[PDB]
Design a protein around this ligand. Sequence first.
Ligand SMILES: [Ga+3]
Length: 106
Amino acid sequence: SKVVYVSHDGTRRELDVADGVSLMQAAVSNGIYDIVGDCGGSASCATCHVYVNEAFTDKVPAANEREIGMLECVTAELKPNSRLSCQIIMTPELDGIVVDVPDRQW
Ligand SMILES: [Ga+3]
């Protein structure tokens, strides 16, 4: 699928996230996520907290409590679609997803 990542600083990236990848994984390989070593592509991170555009946040799978605190590690007023770069998976239909890292600290 077509996925696009936006850094909370205002940078954007667009990768190809097929079936079995996560918004992070693709970007990850692309270095988009040169963060720390928590999720390692398994949704165990406190820094990949990101906001998916409401359009791909409703199609994506339902994130579990593991995507709530991990993702809420940084007080970013967790939205309804917020999620750590490594928790949503991309299907061959949900393509065109736009991600964004929360600058909620501003
Ligand atoms: Ga992560």
